[PDB]
Design a protein around this nucleic acid. Structure first.
Ligand SMILES: [Mg+2]
Ligand SMILES: [Mg+2]
Ligand SMILES: [Mg+2]
Ligand SMILES: [Mg+2]
Ligand SMILES: [Mg+2]
Ligand SMILES: [Mg+2]
Ligand SMILES: [Mg+2]
Ligand SMILES: [Mg+2]
Ligand SMILES: [Mg+2]
Ligand SMILES: [Mg+2]
Ligand SMILES: [Mg+2]
Ligand SMILES: [Mg+2]
Ligand SMILES: [Mg+2]
Ligand SMILES: [Mg+2]
Ligand SMILES: [Mg+2]
Ligand SMILES: [Mg+2]
Ligand SMILES: [Mg+2]
Ligand SMILES: [Mg+2]
Ligand SMILES: [Mg+2]
Ligand SMILES: [Mg+2]
Ligand SMILES: [Mg+2]
Ligand SMILES: [Mg+2]
Ligand SMILES: [Mg+2]
Ligand SMILES: [Mg+2]
Ligand SMILES: [Mg+2]
Ligand SMILES: [Mg+2]
Ligand SMILES: [Mg+2]
Ligand SMILES: [Mg+2]
Ligand SMILES: [Mg+2]
Length: 49
RNA sequence: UGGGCAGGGCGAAGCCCGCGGAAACGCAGGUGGAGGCCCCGAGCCGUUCUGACGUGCAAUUCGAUGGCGCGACCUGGGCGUA
RNA sequence: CAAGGAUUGGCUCCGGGCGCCGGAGCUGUCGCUUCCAAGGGGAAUCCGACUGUUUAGUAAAAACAUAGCCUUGCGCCGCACGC
RNA sequence: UCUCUUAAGGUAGCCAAACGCCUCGUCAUCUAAUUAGUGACGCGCAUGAAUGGAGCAACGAGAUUCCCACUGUCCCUACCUGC
RNA sequence: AAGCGUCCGCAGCGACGCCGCUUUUUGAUUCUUCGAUGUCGGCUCUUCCUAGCAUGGCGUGGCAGCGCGCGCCAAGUGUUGGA
RNA sequence: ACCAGGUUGAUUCUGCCUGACGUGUGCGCUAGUCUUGGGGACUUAGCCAUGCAAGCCAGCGAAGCGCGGAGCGGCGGAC
RNA sequence: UACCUAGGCGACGACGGGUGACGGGGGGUGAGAGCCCGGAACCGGAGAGGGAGCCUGAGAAACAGCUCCCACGUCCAAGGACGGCAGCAGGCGCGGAACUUGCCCAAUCCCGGCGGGGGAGGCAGCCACAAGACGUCGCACGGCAAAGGAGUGCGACUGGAGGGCAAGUCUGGUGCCAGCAGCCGCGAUUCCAGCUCCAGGAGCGCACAUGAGUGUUGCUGCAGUUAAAACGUCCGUAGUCGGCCCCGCGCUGUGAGGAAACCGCGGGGCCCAAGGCGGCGGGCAGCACGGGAGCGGGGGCGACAGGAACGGACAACGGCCGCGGGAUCCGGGGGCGAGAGGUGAAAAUCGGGGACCCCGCGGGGACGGGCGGAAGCGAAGGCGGCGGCCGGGGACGUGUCCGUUGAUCAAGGACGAAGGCCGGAGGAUCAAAGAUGAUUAGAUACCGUCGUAGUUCCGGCAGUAAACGAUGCCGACGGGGCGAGGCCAGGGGGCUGUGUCCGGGAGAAAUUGGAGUGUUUGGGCUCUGGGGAUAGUACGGUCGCAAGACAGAAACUUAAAGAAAUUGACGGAAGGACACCACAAGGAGUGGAGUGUGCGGCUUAAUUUGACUCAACGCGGGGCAGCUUACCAGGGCCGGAUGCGCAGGGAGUGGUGCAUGGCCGUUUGCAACACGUGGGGUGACCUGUCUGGUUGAUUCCGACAACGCGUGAGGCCUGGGGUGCAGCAGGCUGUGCGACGGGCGGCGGCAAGCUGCAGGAGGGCAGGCGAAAACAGGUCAGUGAUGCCCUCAGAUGCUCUGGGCUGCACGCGCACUACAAUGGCGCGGCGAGCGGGAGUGCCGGGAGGCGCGGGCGAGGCCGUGGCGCAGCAGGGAUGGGGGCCUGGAAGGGUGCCCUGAACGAGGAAUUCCUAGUAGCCGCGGGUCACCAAGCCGCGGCGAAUGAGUCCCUGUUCUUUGUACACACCGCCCGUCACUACCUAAGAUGGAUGUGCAGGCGAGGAGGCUGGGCAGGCACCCGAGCCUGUGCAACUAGAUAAGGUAUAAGUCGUAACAAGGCUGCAGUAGGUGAACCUGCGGCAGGAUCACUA
């Protein structure tokens, strides 16, 4: 039965929770909070992550 | 060598005309009247009733039903085959 | 005549291409091929192709015949499409 | 695939068929119910190719089953007429 | 009466064996019939038997009831329509 | 007025698939405010409890106690 | 309705069917042409459960009116009475899918002659359904029919992070599982989470549909040689298209009239915006007016339009008649005398009953060789001896005629190879089927033999081909060259066919005078294609005697299938070249025997383990008594540091060489590899790097769209021989010289070079380094080279002891010693090189021992004595007893005596080798306490034979083929067998819609009447039911056939290479199955090629 493989390998996932939230700014504020990063690298060819 | 065998039905070729077609031809309406065609009359026969009868009308008949009914027929006489 | 349906009398007319055909009207206790005469039909199977033939007197058949198909013999026959 | 054996090993077809013993075969259909009928299936006792096989258009007083309609065949008899 | 039947041989069964009865099966035989006793089934119609299916009365149960089993007496009346 | 990925060892094609965009129908997750619009058309022109949806009047004017409002009459209900 | 005409419509698509179809204003989407949608505001239509009939009224065939029928539903006191929400809310059901049983006539309007009514309608509520704008709690005010909101007024998800596609080769889990992913794809950069990041953002994702993407529907604007696709040919009607000159209609301009919404535009500070509101526009192949051109009508030309005529030619054009040719086969005669036939080889078969062969005669059918070709003709299929008849044909020539008669085609008609079918005739060859003889693993095939249909003719059917130029017809235009057509002209000429070559242009390319004049896209007409598979299959139809033909889907399934070319690889393709992991000519062998050793297997407590074709198997320098040593039985010991029992380091001959480094092997015993620049091609690529010749060599000569370089090869380095000088003492080691293929002869000549001889010590001496690319080669067991995984105290650590690595029914590799007389044994004699350390005296029979201590030499050969063909004095295996050596320890070694095995020349197979070589023969070194039958070296003796060839194996090159690219151990086809899905068939059915026809027939208007509000009668409308039937669409079904997908199992191997029988399609038959066979085609062939 391969459905016996279906649930325990789902249950083989470890559960690592969320961090404490640095409540993320929304809207034009986030569009500025990425635009600060767009000017730090002189534009192109930017490593974003 | 003679003779016998209602009446209908279906509608084959061929033909005529109309329509269609470039042509080949195709439809349609008449005409025609073929066929071991169809229903059947006289007649013939013998399917069924396993009817009647079954010391009978009759040493095989009767009735109804049925089949055939211009034929590969039936029939008188003559003749042949014992 | 696949199956299946409608109609059908009498009378009085009208029309036609007038031995007949079509139509209309009237009429009967709805009834009309009025008696007589006169197919029951459908779906299939088996067998024999068919029409025909047969056990006169228990069998009419699927049997026999048939055309077709085939084989055989025969050039001393009726003459090979022949017997 | 191997092997034995025959003159050759049943081909195309067709079938519990009028040909199947088992057998009222098995499945389907038909029915309330079917040893029947039909359609399938085929290791077919013992189907099969002019000893003709398969095939059903048409035909049939042939053999068989179902349906419709019909009916004294029956339920279940009764009455009438002639002789 | 080995065993089964919750325990329990006999409520009801009952192996292994044994004893009978019947002439409703089929044999066995060949006594009667071959100078013929019409041979299956059905239909029809009457009667008889009981080894009793129903109906009447009972006894028994591992019979609460309902039902079912087992046994007894009794042959009066019954014992169908179909594919 | 646009292409991109995908057949191959690589190539050039044909070729279709897929991505990329709008639209409307439904689903899903999510959601602070306001304005505006839409909403049992698709399947079932399926079935319907209950209430309401088309009434009105000036002619004549009864009961009832001049007021009155019944019925007749009229108009609409076919929009 | 009565009577009478025979009409009416249709490929300009009638009629019938379908529609999950109300139409339109419009909407969506695209640059546009278009495509798609319009339930939905407004307009028109239609309906009120299905129907039908009607009353009233101006208006209804009304339905929140009536009458009846039908289907559902309700109440009843059982007599009867009712219900039609496709009105508004609301409920149920349906489904993916859609709101409150709220308030009110305040606004918009309607009915009513006003006070009234209005679920029309508005307001609010519900809903992220949509558009727009903007962020990350309670008074007063305000508005409101009323309330609430607006307006003052105070106190962050959604999806993703491999590519397309923006953003992670971070962390943990998962290990082809789970899962993810539109496509490609991943199995940890793709799963599941965390983080971070990206995208859009109060929104976002998904599914479905549609548009664009798409010039993949092509009017604009495709494609049809080979990718899917020109119908076999010709005729042919509608249709569509169509020469020149010389009032009507098309077309077109403006204008009318045409609803708003909408849309386009324009304003317009609703706070902005979407808006509101106001301007202006568009729409229509209808109408009116205008229009210089175009078309008709009618004449005139007579078209490098056509038809007709004529002329001389030309013609494998057809039909028929006649003549003829030789060959195959048969009959018959004569000769001959043993075979013949047939094959890769044979067999079957016929042969003294005279075959075969030779010669004559005869009969019969079929067939035209050579000439015969990129030559002719025909519309295609097709047409080939000769003569004649009848008929036809195109081209040419022409002041001949006609004058637009034309082009192309649905429908229709005719012809149409082979095979097939029918009837008749005939039957020589060949030959499906069938039968045999072989081949083969099998062989139903290929090969041999035989043989029926058939092949042949006549009359008909059939109507198909790779019917191909895989290329429709007509027409205009477009480069040269060479040809072997026909006619004409006479002036390397013109017409018309026909090939070919080179360019242009085109094309994805191969290629191509059309496949050109194509995004600068438009000549006409017809047909076809729209990813693959299903499938040219099914159903229906038409045709056919049948075979089948024509025509022609879908369900399900799939991300590729395909084209042309490039580079490889491969080929039972051709041609080369080369080699003792080749062969010939040879030599010695191996495999046989015993032993030594290695491998497997088995056993075992363990018999550690790597490696298994060359490139595993005396290999791991692997000759193991301990150690080595990884294994087994035990015992010790903790190199378990370090950071506050845990963390973590460290260790491991534990695992993984498919995680690696390094090294080594193999391709190699090769000759290949690459760059710079330029050229060819759209490109991958090619040239350079080569036709040929040459070389061990891609070494060079040479021609060359290449030119120059670079690795490798060579040069080189070491040893070897000859001697010049120098130095010094089994003579030693420095420095040079010496050979280069130089000279000569002959081939080849820009030659490179090859080959013989002379000269010479020497004319390919032996090694060394050794390119690029690979391989899942080997090594984690060389490593203080190592990632990762596992183990770490009862250890997979280290160490000790014992055992094993040495076990043994057996299979195998490599060697050793032999089988003897070319020998063996016993003495005497002569005796090497590498290596240069070792000898000596004494004891002992030997092995060995002891003490000093600068210090070595073999088998053999020669001479000679014995044995004397014998399992023998060959052989020395096995075993017994004794003596020693090494070591802690003998299974080790050595020595002595004795025992004395197989083996009498070794099956199929198979290795190595060309001169001081093979072989024989020892010696020394590595390993080593002890030990070599091994390895690496060394010398002694010393051949045979080729001076080659690709036969066999391989490698390599050229050309070619390829459906291979994991690269032939590849790819691939079909049956069988299992499961799943789907479609068609299928006796027997089943249910629904709809239309006809008939039967019965409720009700009802009007008329005629009446117990004059009843009832009756006839007519008319007519539901509803019943029966029969048509059409449309659906479904059950025993059985049975396909298709597709399965995990791929069995059987083969049909195709791809000459795929091992060239392939393919047609047709016919046959076979388990791909398929085989016959006939005729075709090249898409393995041939562009020969009396030139
Ligand atoms: Mg007759
Ligand atoms: Mg008769
Ligand atoms: Mg008679
Ligand atoms: Mg009749
Ligand atoms: Mg009939
Ligand atoms: Mg008969
Ligand atoms: Mg008789
Ligand atoms: Mg016959
Ligand atoms: Mg059979
Ligand atoms: Mg039966
Ligand atoms: Mg019966
Ligand atoms: Mg026979
Ligand atoms: Mg028989
Ligand atoms: Mg008869
Ligand atoms: Mg008697
Ligand atoms: Mg008697
Ligand atoms: Mg509709
Ligand atoms: Mg609409
Ligand atoms: Mg093609
Ligand atoms: Mg002779
Ligand atoms: Mg032919
Ligand atoms: Mg023929
Ligand atoms: Mg014939
Ligand atoms: Mg032959
Ligand atoms: Mg068909
Ligand atoms: Mg190709
Ligand atoms: Mg040890
Ligand atoms: Mg060794
Ligand atoms: Mg082949």
């Amino acid at each position: 039965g391969s459905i016996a493989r279906a649930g325990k390998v789902r249950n083989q996932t470890p559960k690592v929770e969320k961090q404490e939230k640095p409540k993320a700014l929304t809207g034009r504020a986030r569009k500025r909070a990425l635009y600060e990063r767009r000017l730090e690298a002189n534009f192109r060819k930017m490593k974003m992550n």
